[PDB]
Write a protein that binds this ligand. Structure first.
Ligand SMILES: Nc1cc(Oc2ccc(Nc3ncccc3C(=O)Nc3ccc(F)cc3F)cc2F)ccn1
Length: 293
């Protein structure tokens, strides 16, 4: 029901349209089944002959056009996201069958959390601070466009062949579906999200990086995180996290949202901490965090 969509959404999608002849979706090759949204390996033909590797996001399909319109908006939101540290949109493919297809450049190393969790990987303090800095650069760009992420976490950050981090997003009044453990105090209490609350999320993301992907607050039930935080608590300093990086995390977790550093200041501060390291310090996984979900 393409005509019942929205003429402005349809014209915006038209400028990023992919013809069904120039895209081959390998439905047998799944890049994570996820939930009610699937990602597959894809081949895209660019201009002439070019056989580029891509990720194709789908699913499919209950409400008349409501979920299709939201799906197309999420993809169209990426149009002006051109920054080395933010995931790009190759385009959108309109299937003459069912669900429209969102086409993204392939990220060889997948998500940042599974990458750092992998025990065959040997990151140093510098590499992990490096990833945090790249996320800060991407967020600095997004904040300058007044774009509020709402779900910044290592699981939503993508890693390519050159190890360049691409900030991305994989995918109800009082009902729970929210990433409460990455959420700012004000966002848990009121349900409002700002750049300052993304700064809180970024601090948790730095914690995930320094612990090599440990789940935040393991002992704490999702429903009582506000009660836990208000007792006067923050995540402990990871074993391999340098003191000035911990101090930056505590600044991201400032109880006054307006007292939190901006992403521009975080880029500056983290870039200085990063420059002091040479790649000597190896980061090992914590035994108390292994197999902890
Ligand atoms: N192996 C691999 C796996 C991949 O999976 C995906 C990861 C993220 C998205 N993300 C999206 N899918 C559809 C619409 C928008 C986004 C998205 O990330 N938007 C977005 C970008 C930057 C932001 F700050 C916020 C956002 F919401 C899609 C994938 F297929 C992809 C590649 N390589």
């Amino acid at each position: 029901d393409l005509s019942a969509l929205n003429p402005e959404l349809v014209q915006a999608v038209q400028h990023v349209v992919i013809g069904p002849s120039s895209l081959i979706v390998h439905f047998n090759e799944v890049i994570g089944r996820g939930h009610f949204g699937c990602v597959y390996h894809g081949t895209l033909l660019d201009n002439d002959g070019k056989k580029i590797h891509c990720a194709v996001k789908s699913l499919n399909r209950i409400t008349d056009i409501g979920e299709v319109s939201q799906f197309l908006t999420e993809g169209i939101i990426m149009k002006d996201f051109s920054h080395p540290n933010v995931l790009s949109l190759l385009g959108i493919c309109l299937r003459s069958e069912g669900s429209p297809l969102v086409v993204l450049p392939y990220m060889k190393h997948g998500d940042l959390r599974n990458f750092i969790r992998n025990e065959t990987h040997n990151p140093t303090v510098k590499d992990l601070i490096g990833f945090g800095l790249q996320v800060a650069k991407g967020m600095k760009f997004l904040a300058s466009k007044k774009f509020v992420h709402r779900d910044l976490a290592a699981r939503n950050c993508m890693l390519d062949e050159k190890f360049t981090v691409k900030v991305a997003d994989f995918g109800n009044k009082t009902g729970a579906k929210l990433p409460v453990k990455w959420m700012a105090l004000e966002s848990l209490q009121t349900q409002k999200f700002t750049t300052k609350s993304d700064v809180w999320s970024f601090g948790v993301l730095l914690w995930e990086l320094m612990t090599r992907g440990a789940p935040p607050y393991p002992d704490v039930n999702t429903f009582d995180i506000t009660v836990y935080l208000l007792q006067g608590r923050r995540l402990l300093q990871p074993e391999y996290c340098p003191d000035p990086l911990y101090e930056v995390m505590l600044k991201c977790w400032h109880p006054k949202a307006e007292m939190r550093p901006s992403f521009s200041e975080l880029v500056s501060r983290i870039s200085a901490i990063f420059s002091t390291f040479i790649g000597e310090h190896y980061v090992h996984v914590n035994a108390t965090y292994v197999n902890v979900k």
